[PDB]
């Protein structure tokens, strides 16, 4: 039973980074050379594990997280980073064991005159914990006065839309990202590389 990484990387629709998706992959085998020997990725960087050793290892569980961000924000998808994405949208732990994979998706996620459907969280009271998801749309209390659910002074809607236009510079183009987390708990391994 081949691991279903295909329906993550080749999915037709990707989610907004604030509402990043997660697929739990278990009880399967996979040849990871299909990924790290692919010419389709502009970023393929692993932490705590070398890509060329993935096929020698088994893990209790593997998570595959996916989302869309800007090109010059792919740097934030790494351990120990800061910024609106790492702080408020998708946060990797310091001791991350996994791989970050990204590729330019201007042809799929942009529209002449702007694609506006991809969003990110711009305001948040605190930084996300590692691997935390926050999809709430409560009004952000920028000051000390309660907002009571009302947009106004010091009370901001927390989400902001990317403006993905084909003519944007590369740093402002959309990039699809897949984060693979390899976890080894005190429990039977079930996901093995080949």
């Amino acid at each position: 039973n081949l691991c279903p990484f295909g329906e993550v990387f080749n999915a037709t629709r990707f989610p907004s980074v604030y509402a990043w998706n997660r697929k739990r992959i278990s009880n399967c085998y996979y040849d990871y050379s299909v990924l790290y020997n692919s010419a389709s990725f502009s970023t393929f960087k692993c932490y705590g594990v070398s890509p060329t050793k993935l096929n020698d290892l088994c893990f209790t569980q593997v998570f595959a997280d996916s989302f869309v961000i800007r090109g010059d924000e792919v740097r934030q998808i790494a351990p120990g980073q800061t910024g609106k994405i790492a702080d408020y949208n998708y946060k990797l732990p310091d001791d991350f064991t996994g791989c970050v994979i990204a590729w330019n998706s201007n042809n799929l996620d942009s529209k002449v005159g702007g694609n506006y459907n991809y969003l990110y969280r711009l305001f948040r009271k605190s930084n996300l914990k590692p691997f935390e998801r926050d999809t709430s749309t409560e009004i952000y209390q920028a000051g000390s006065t309660p907002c009571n659910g009302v947009e106004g002074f010091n009370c901001y809607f927390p989400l902001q839309s990317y403006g993905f236009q084909p003519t944007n510079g590369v740093g402002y183009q959309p990039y699809r990202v897949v984060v693979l987390s390899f976890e080894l708990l005190d429990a039977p391994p079930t996901v093995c590389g080949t």
Epitope: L122, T137, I139, E151, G152, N154, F157, S161, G163
Partner: single-chain antibody
Framework: EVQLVESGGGLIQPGGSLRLSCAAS????????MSWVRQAPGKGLEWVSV???????YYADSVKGRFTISRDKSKNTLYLQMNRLRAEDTAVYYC?????????????????????????WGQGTLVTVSSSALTQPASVSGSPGQSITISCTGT?????????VSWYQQHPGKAPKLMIY???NRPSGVSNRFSGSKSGNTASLTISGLQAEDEADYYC??????????FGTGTKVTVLG
């Protein structure tokens, strides 16, 4: 390249309905607070409605229960539905955008949606229906190369409650142009001859080295404690000679 292009104006009978459109480009209509501002023939600017990033809408009492502001994000378009129309609604209608979350790119001020100044305007569309305000002096004049000052009194609830006073220049037949924001700040590209200040409930615009091109109508505007906006009555600046 930010642009706001309006359409839908026309002559309609009292009691009729009309929908105005404001097609935006260069930015996402949901990423900025969008307002409609109208101007009756020969009169001053009147703010009437705004829509916030989360969809919240606020209205001037003069249009409550009759006008509805909305947007279509797929069309990047802002709308004003005008029902139960009155002859007093005859005016040029402008759509206007408020500031970017980052403010201006040449100065670090963090991120905030408290950016209360109309930095980009549509060209205006006239609606003819045919079968309050901050205090400004009616007219001010000065000699070429000299300085004049324009006052703008409000209340604890707007000019004197916040440092969110902005000033606009309007030539005949043209949309207003932002000259000063946040009381004393100048956008890039606006002449250093324009400056702004405030004391108590009165804001002031000073134009130095007056030139013939400075002849125009000038309006102040303020955020209000009701999350609305309010324009001054307008000042006609005359450059002698």
């Amino acid at each position: 390249e930010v642009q706001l292009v309006e359409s839908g104006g026309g002559l309609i009978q009292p009691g009729g309905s009309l929908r105005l459109s404001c097609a935006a480009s260069g930015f996402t209509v949901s990423n900025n607070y969008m307002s409609w501002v109208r101007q009756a023939p020969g009169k001053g600017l009147e703010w009437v409605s705004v829509i916030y990033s989360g969809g919240s809408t606020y209205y001037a009492d003069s249009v409550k229960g009759r006008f509805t502001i909305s947007r279509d994000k797929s069309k990047n378009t802002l709308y004003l539905q005008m029902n139960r129309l009155r002859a007093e609604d005859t005016a040029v209608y402008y759509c206007a955008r408020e500031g970017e979350v980052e403010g201006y790119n040449d100065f670090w001020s963090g991120y905030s949606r408290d950016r209360y100044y109309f930095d980009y305007w549509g060209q205006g569309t006239l609606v003819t229906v045919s079968s309050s305000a901050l205090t400004q002096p009616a007219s001010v004049s000065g000699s070429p190369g000299q300085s004049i000052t324009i006052s703008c009194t409000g209340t604890s609830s707007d000019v004197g409650g916040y440092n969110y006073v902005s000033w606009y220049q309007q030539h005949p037949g043209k949309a207003p142009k932002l000259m000063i924001y946040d009381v004393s700040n100048r956008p890039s590209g606006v002449s250093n001859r324009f400056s702004g200040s405030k004391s108590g409930n009165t804001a002031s615009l000073t134009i130095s080295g007056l030139q013939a091109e400075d002849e125009a109508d000038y309006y102040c505007s303020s955020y209000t404690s009701s999350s609305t906006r309010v324009f001054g009555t307008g000042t006609k600046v005359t450059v002698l000679g």
